[PDB]
């Protein structure tokens, strides 16, 4: 997260870290045994880390659980990044409480201007690289479709939305992928892609979760 702030331990209880010997992507806990992340984060040997704050130190409240199966959306296109969503089933159910909790799926899509919370352990530098130990947070608004398509002509599908600031300075960045975009207590987006990080007129692009509620529910129900 570029231009954000330190969330504070356990303030984003649904945030997960996908680990393979190092943190490579984020994710969101949607129920005791399922995590939602980005399709491009797919790889074998994924360990899901819940209840994390400092990802480099065992501080208490962490639960490390292996991924039982990772379900990438069947229509995911790695070139266009359309349908960039993946479900991960945990080998064992997580212990829910206060420090670890699930986030709700949306009932309707969010409108432009809605304020959301984006979080992650990604790069905090727009130019260069600096990975934080603790979880970073950023409040950002969902941008209008016209502004989003103006910024990325011919690349925005109906399954994506832009959020952020056209003036630059605040944005999600490498390491934040798969992470949550929560608005009004509902998971509305998944960190996906962008042209660089926090660059002027190049806001972040996110997977539009509301278009996948039916798919998520049917898939979970069958697995």
């Amino acid at each position: 997260i570029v231009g954000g702030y330190t969330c504070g331990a356990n303030t984003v209880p649904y945030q997960v870290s996908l680990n393979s010997g190092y943190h490579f992507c984020g994710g969101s806990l949607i129920n005791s045994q399922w995590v939602v992340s980005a399709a491009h984060c797919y790889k074998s040997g994924i360990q899901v880390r819940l209840g994390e704050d400092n990802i480099n130190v065992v501080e208490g409240n962490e639960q490390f659980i292996s991924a039982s199966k990772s379900i990438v959306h069947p229509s995911y296109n790695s070139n266009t990044l359309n349908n960039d969503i993946m479900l991960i089933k945990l080998k064992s159910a997580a212990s829910l409480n206060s420090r670890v909790a699930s986030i709700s799926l949306p009932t309707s899509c969010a409108s432009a201007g809605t304020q959301c919370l984006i979080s992650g352990w990604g790069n905090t530098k727009s130019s260069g690289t600096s990975y934080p130990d603790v979880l970073k947070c950023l409040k950002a608004p969902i941008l209008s479709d016209s502004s989003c398509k103006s910024a990325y002509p011919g690349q925005i599908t109906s399954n994506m939305f832009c959020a952020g600031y056209l003036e630059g300075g605040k944005d999600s960045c490498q390491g934040d992928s798969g992470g949550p975009v929560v608005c009004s207590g509902k998971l509305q987006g998944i960190v996906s892609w962008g042209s660089g990080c926090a660059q002027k007129n190049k806001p972040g692009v996110y997977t539009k979760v509301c278009n996948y509620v039916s798919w998520i529910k049917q898939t979970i129900a069958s697995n």
């Binding site: 943190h23 992507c25 990604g122 490498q174 390491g175 962008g194 042209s195 660089g196």
Partner: peptide
């Protein structure tokens, strides 16, 4: 344009 996913490492396209 050159667009990259926000994973570690990033996956870029144009």
């Amino acid at each position: 344009s050159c667009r990259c996913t926000k994973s570690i490492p990033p996956q870029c396209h144009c």
